[PDB]
Design an enzyme around this catalytic site. Structure first.
Site, PDB file in Angstrom:
ATOM      1  N   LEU A   1       0.880  -1.189   0.000  1.00 16.79           N
ATOM      2  CA  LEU A   1       0.000   0.000   0.000  1.00 16.79           C
ATOM      3  C   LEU A   1       0.903   1.220   0.000  1.00 16.79           C
ATOM      4  CD1 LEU A   1      -2.600  -1.385   2.502  1.00 16.79           C
ATOM      5  CD2 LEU A   1      -3.187  -0.398   0.282  1.00 16.79           C
ATOM      6  N   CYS A   2       2.211   0.999  -0.001  1.00 13.59           N
ATOM      7  CA  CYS A   2       3.178   2.117   0.077  1.00 13.59           C
ATOM      8  C   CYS A   2       3.079   2.956  -1.181  1.00 13.59           C
ATOM      9  CB  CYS A   2       4.587   1.565   0.160  1.00 13.59           C
ATOM     10  SG  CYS A   2       4.654  -0.009   1.048  1.00 13.59           S
ATOM     11  N   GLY A   3       2.584   2.368  -2.262  1.00 13.82           N
ATOM     12  CA  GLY A   3       2.563   3.090  -3.539  1.00 13.82           C
ATOM     13  C   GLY A   3       3.603   2.502  -4.458  1.00 13.82           C
TER      14      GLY A   3
END
Lengths: 130, 128, 285
Positions: free
Chosen positions: C89-91
């Site tokens: 979900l960090c990108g």
């Protein structure tokens, strides 16, 4: 009257001015005075002593280094402890570290964040009909 | 035989949520989802090719008893087809035995359990 | 599209938006605390940095610098410390970093150097356990605020390596933090050559009590450990900032999807009312 700084890889312990430093240098214990000649030493596991207006604070240091300019002293110690406090355990420093830290500072953070990710993943499966 | 099939398929559908997103799942969940995919690929039957009861029972026993774990998914259907050819050529007596006593209360009879796991193992050595 | 399933879609996307908004808030807070931790860690690294400058300004002897400070000519074996966020979900950061690990593992593998990898994080541990690059060293379960004690388990070994000759260099791939929105990946060298502009050191002289050689040999491992710790803290801050940005974008996308689904649901509601009144009027007539 020398600018002492007990720094550590995590945080700065002290930055005040001190009368005397009873440093545990590897070769042998060394005392430092406001106009000490330039020096750089390796410490050993021992109990460094800070003499401040006749008050002795025994900061235990399991290891670290020391740079002594004529005007300032820096202690790049690995770990700095104050067993003199004794109540440090009962004190939040350790007591909170047990509950106010790790227990909720980390464990609760991990639980909440993981639960949020789980709810997200489940509902994103549930929305897989748009 | 089909109770394990239904349970594993439902559980794989449940873990599809973690399958779509999560890549850090433990080895248990990886093997679990892999078994679910095995079972799903088992059901990809073609058209106008019905399978009699004994054939389906043999295939489901082979899949549910971990004899199909080593086979990669894209070949499973082919595997199944080839397996049936084996039973249609190498051993018709195992199919006859499976069909004959399909009504008994405990299907995995020691007589039935042997000569079928043996047939599966023999097919495993012959193909790949 | 039955005016009721669309309501379920709207509820699901609203739940997604709420969860994403909460995650964005907590990622912003943890990014702030990680920035505070980096600021608190800065003085120690800075102090030991000018200590490196002064000491390297002296003891220039190659034989004297044969300990760690030495530059292996063969460079036959190299090692990469990759610090990768532990949860996704960090990108694009997790990928941007694991890509530069490749650009490196290749440009290096192309030099005939046997590139190996010590990984900080589960995300990295996997990309490589899968690729086949089983991390020569893996530090997982890394908290927002770890202590230098943690990186030690891996840095000790990488260093014992540049000493066992098993390696001829150590680079760390970590996620820098340029702007609260930008988080460029970056590589740094972990070989303690130092020797900055003589101007930086000012040639401060000291009477090294245990000896110049002993002080250098005991201070270089601590310097590289401090560099690894600073890189890990910056990586944690960049991870939190990237997660905050990703959740902001996801919340905006979820709000747009909620608006579109609301329009569709209202159209379906009007159609349902029209159909109901039409059939009721037909039955009456």
């Amino acid at each position: 009257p020398i600018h002492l700084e007990i720094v550590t890889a995590e945080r700065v312990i002290l930055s005040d001015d001190v009368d005397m430093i009873s440093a545990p240098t590897k070769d042998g214990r060394v005392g430092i005075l406001p106009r000490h000649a330039p020096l750089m030493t390796i410490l050993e596991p021992g109990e460094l002593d800070i003499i401040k207006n006749g008050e002795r604070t025994p900061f235990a240091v399991s290891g670290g280094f020391m740079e002594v300019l004529p005007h300032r002293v820096t202690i790049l110690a690995d770990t700095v402890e104050r067993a003199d406090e004794i109540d440090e355990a009962r004190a939040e420093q350790a007591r909170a570290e047990a509950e106010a830290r790790r227990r909720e500072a980390q464990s609760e953070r991990d639980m909440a964040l993981a639960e949020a990710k789980l709810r997200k993943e489940m509902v994103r499966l549930r929305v897989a009909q748009l | 035989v089909a109770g394990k099939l239904k349970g594993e398929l439902a559980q794989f559908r449940d873990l599809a949520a973690f399958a779509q997103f999560a890549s850090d799942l433990d080895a248990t969940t990886k093997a679990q989802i892999e078994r679910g995919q095995r079972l799903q690929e088992l059901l990809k039957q073609p058209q106008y090719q019905p399978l009699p009861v004994e054939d389906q029972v043999a295939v489901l026993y082979a899949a549910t008893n971990n004899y199909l774990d080593d086979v990669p998914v894209p070949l499973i259907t082919k595997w199944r087809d080839d397996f049936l050819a084996f039973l249609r050529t190498a051993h018709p007596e195992v199919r006859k035995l499976i069909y004959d006593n399909r009504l008994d209360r405990k299907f995995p009879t020691p007589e039935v359990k042997e000569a079928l796991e043996a047939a599966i193992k023999e097919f495993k050595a012959t193909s790949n | 599209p039955s005016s009721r399933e669309i309501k379920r879609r709207i509820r699901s996307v609203k739940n997604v938006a709420q969860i994403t908004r909460a995650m964005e808030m907590v990622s912003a807070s943890k990014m702030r605390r990680a920035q505070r931790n980096v600021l608190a860690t800065r003085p120690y690294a800075d102090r030991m940095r000018e200590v490196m400058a002064n000491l390297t300004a002296r003891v220039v002897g190659a034989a004297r610098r044969g300990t760690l400070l030495e530059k292996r000519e063969t460079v036959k074996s190299v090692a990469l410390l990759v610090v990768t966020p532990d949860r996704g979900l960090c990108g694009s950061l997790v990928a941007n970093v694991l890509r530069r690990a490749g650009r490196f593992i290749t440009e290096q593998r192309a030099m005939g150097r046997t590139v190996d990898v010590y990984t900080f994080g589960r995300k990295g541990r996997d990309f490589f356990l899968r690729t086949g690059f089983a991390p020569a060293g893996e530090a997982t379960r890394l908290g927002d605020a770890p202590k230098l004690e943690a990186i030690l388990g891996v840095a000790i070994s990488a260093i014992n390596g540049f000493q066992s000759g098993k390696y001829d260099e150590l680079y760390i791939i970590y996620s820098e933090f340029i702007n609260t929105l930008v988080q460029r990946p970056a590589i740094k060298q972990l070989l303690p050559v130092e020797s900055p502009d003589i101007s930086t050191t000012t040639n401060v002289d000291y009477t090294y009590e245990p000896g110049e050689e002993e002080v250098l040999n005991s201070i270089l491992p601590r310097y590289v450990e401090t560099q690894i710790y600073q890189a890990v803290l910056e990586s944690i801050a960049s991870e939190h900032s990237a997660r905050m940005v990703a959740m902001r974008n996801a919340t905006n996308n979820a709000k747009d999807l909620v608006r579109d689904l609301t329009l569709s649901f209202n159209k379906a509601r009007q159609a349902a009312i029209t159909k109901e009144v039409s059939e009721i009027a037909s039955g009456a007539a």
